[model samples]
Target: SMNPPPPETSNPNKPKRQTNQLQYLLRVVLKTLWKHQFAWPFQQPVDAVKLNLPDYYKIIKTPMDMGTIKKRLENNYYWNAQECIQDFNTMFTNCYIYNKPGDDIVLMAEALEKLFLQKINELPTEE
Candidate 1:
């Protein structure tokens, strides 16, 4: 439902960026939802007809790899708060992704069920 902070913040030449702790937490939660509730079931051979977003049964390709950057020379494709909210806008449109049929929720829960299975290799595994 949200995106990360700015790209310039990640730049070494720039000063440190200000951040919203709540929004940052929300983004992480939503990112977790994406990993579990959307991306996971999407990879499996499951029936997901009703648990759908506005753009058909298809989801945004951009958010699948959030908090990252892409580049072609000086041109950079960065996923910022703009991209995050934009993606949520697409998912919500005239309606929230919630308040759907119970059957749909049931299926989506199947996706949400697997959220814990996600593993980021580069991240530190232990605190």
Candidate 2:
């Protein structure tokens, strides 16, 4: 028998369809970050850091879900709060996929998010 063909890749330029699940949300965030980190690094405005952090915290935080905690911190020079929370929501969903209704759900959610973050960071630095 012949070998199966490779799956099609998604193009990043298009805005994704509306979906409310954690995994779906995370994937969009992850894919967007992976697609643009070096060139844009979340592409928030350059003066974002000078702004008060309260608005940012409403959406994002540190000690993120990705496993490469030290690596991500060391590599980046800025923050993207909106992207961060969107990513976290998806990661929580991934955790829910494995976790029972009541067990260590918070930690599991972080773990899932961390794993994906690490995976995205480890990719070859791009054009």
User: Going through the candidates in order, what is the number of backbone clashes in each?
Assistant: 0, 5
lDDT by residue (tens digit), candidate 1, 1-127: 2232322314444333223422432345345665553554323222224443444224332222222211110132223334433433333331224335455544555444334223221223222
lDDT of 2 at 101: 66
Candidate 2 has an lDDT of 0.38
**How many angstroms is residue 5 displaced in model 1 relative to the true structure, after the best TM-score fit?**
28
The count of residue-pair clashes in candidate 1 stands at 0
Off by over 4 Å in 2: 1-64, 77-79, 105-127
- Candidate 1's TM-score: 0.28
**Tens digits of lDDT, candidate 2, 1-127:** 1222221123355344322322333455445443433323222221224643334333432213342222222333114333434444543554455345666544544444565566544443222
Which candidate comes out best when scored by lDDT? 2
Which ten residues in a row are the worst by lDDT in model 1?
A: 65-74
